[PDB]
Design a protein around this ligand. Sequence first.
Ligand SMILES: N[C@@H](CCC(=O)O)C(=O)O
Length: 258
Amino acid sequence: KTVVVTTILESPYVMMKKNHEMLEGNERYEGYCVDLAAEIAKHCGFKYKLTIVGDGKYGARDADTKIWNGMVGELVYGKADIAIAPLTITLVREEVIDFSKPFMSLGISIMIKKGTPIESAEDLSKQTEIAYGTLDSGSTKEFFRRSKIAVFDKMWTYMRSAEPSVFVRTTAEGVARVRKSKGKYAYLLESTMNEYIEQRKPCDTMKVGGNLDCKGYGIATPKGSSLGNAVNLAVLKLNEQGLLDKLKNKWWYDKGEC
Ligand SMILES: N[C@@H](CCC(=O)O)C(=O)O
């Protein structure tokens, strides 16, 4: 009867508490999604075990083998009951799993080292001296692969064959790469994560341009699962109560450094 919660380490959604060497199970982690977890549980009614996805990925279906990896996979292949993390709600995913009403909104955005000669996605697509990429197995990559919009199509045609690879394994790798590339690498990632990093020392990154799209994160559960209707109801209620906004103040604004 214990629901197993699959999630991923992504600041400030899920972070290792500073004294993680000890404290067991769910007491080891902290962050927005951890708090959201508890709330959903207390409101929906049930206990849960927080588990960090093995492959540390969000979720992509290998075109060749039609096999889903990451959190989406662990949901489609009975390895987890519910996914509570910043998992983007998308068309292709809504065909093999179920999402609640979004609990937070976001859009793809651009992160550059301060002083980089880039002010927009169009700027990036009209030059080549500055490389750029996204997270390897997430929705941002797939957004570009699929885009029909001229600019993003052009950006994708560049990214897929870019050498060396512009794709990263984690958000931290993308960010690091932006910081250690002397203004020669731009990173495309979701605004939520982009804005968090922007308010954290060394305060050398920046967000330029507007969001490239509008999307939402949602609690995910297996097709026709048992919690489906409940969680959506819990989410709508927390949204109603205004508790999701408060969690946002807690983890984003009340912790700026620049
Ligand atoms: N939120 C994305 C991961 C981050 C990204 O793709 O930029 C997903 O659920 O795949």
